[PDB]
Chain A
C-alpha cells in the first residue's frame, strides 16, 4: 500500500493563520 498521504496545505483556522512558507 502507498501512504499515508496528506495535503501539503494544512486545514484553515477560523481566521487565517500566520506567514510561514517553510
Chain B
C-alpha cells in the first residue's frame, strides 16, 4: 500500500495540534482586541501559559466548525495562511492577524518524539498575542471578525464558487473584506522547526 502525506499518523497529529493552536489563538485574539466582551471569556491554561477561552457556546461551535475544515488541508500540506480579520461596523477591515504556515512535504514514520519542542514554539506565539494590545490602537466599538484561508493552487484547480468541507460552506472573500491601503505591518513572531515554520504578523489600518 502506497501512502500519501495525509496518510501519515504524524501528519494527522500535527494537523490536530496546529488546528487546536489556531482555536486557542482565535479565542485569544477575540479577547485581546475585544471583538467580544471580556465577560464571555474565562482564563484557562494551554501550553503551560494563561489563555482566554470564550464560554459562549454558539461562538465556540462556530470557531470549531471553521477550523475543523482547516485540519484536512493541514494534513495535505495545502494551507499557506489562516487569517483573522477584524472589521468595523462599516464592514471595513481594521486589523488582520496573519498566520503564515509552511510544513515539510513529509514527516517521519519514526514518530518517536514528534512533538518534543512544538509546545515551546506555540507558547511563544500565544505570549506575543497576549500583549499585542500594547502595540496596537484600540479598535472602534461594534467590530466583528471573519476567518480567511489561503491554500496552494493544485494541478486540477477546483473552479466551484461554493466549496463545502465537513458540511461547512466556504466562498471567496471580496476585495472589500480584505483590502487595506498600505497598512502598518507589525511582526509578532517567526519560528522554525523540523515539522513547521510559522510567521505571525498584524496588518493595521492606517
> Interface on A for B, CB 8 Å cutoff?
1-14, 16
Segment at the interface with A among B2-10, B124-132, B143-151: B143-151
Stretch at the interface among B14-22, B105-113, B168-176, B193-201: B168-176
Asked if B28 lies at the interface with its beta carbon under 8 angstroms from chain A, I say no
Contact A6 B152 (CB under 8 A): no
Q: Which 9 A-B pairs have the closest CB atoms?
A: A3-B150, A4-B148, A8-B169, A6-B173, A4-B173, A12-B58, A5-B170, A2-B153, A2-B151
Within the assembled complex, what's the spacing in Å between the Cα atoms of A12 and B171? Answer: 17
Cβ-defined contact, B150 with A2, below 8 A: yes
Interface pair B151/A5, CB less than 8 Å apart:
yes
Report B-chain residues with C-beta under 8 Å of the C-beta of A4: 83, 148-150, 172-173, 178
B residues in contact with A5, CB < 8 Å: 148-151, 163, 170-173
Q: Is the CB of B149 within 8 A of A3?
A: yes
Main secondary structure of the interface of A (DSSP, over half): loop
A6–B148 CB distance below 8 A: yes
- Which residues of B are found within 8 Å of A3, using beta-carbon distances? 80-81, 148-151, 172-173
Contact A11 B144 (CB under 8 A): yes
Does A9 contact B178, Cβ atoms closer than 8 Å? no
The contact of B144 among A1, A8, A10, by CB within 8 Å, is A10
Mark each residue of chain B from 60 to 86: 1 if its CB lies under 8 Å from any CB of chain A, else 0: 001001100000000000001101000
Q: How far is the CB of A5 from chain B (nearest CB, A)?
A: 5
B187 within 8 A of A: no
In this assembly, does B177 line the interface, its C-beta being within 8 Å of a C-beta of chain A? Answer: yes
Q: Given the complex, which residues of A lie within 8 Å of B171, measured CB to CB?
A: 5-8
Neighbour of A9 across the interface among B62, B144, B151, CB < 8 A: B62
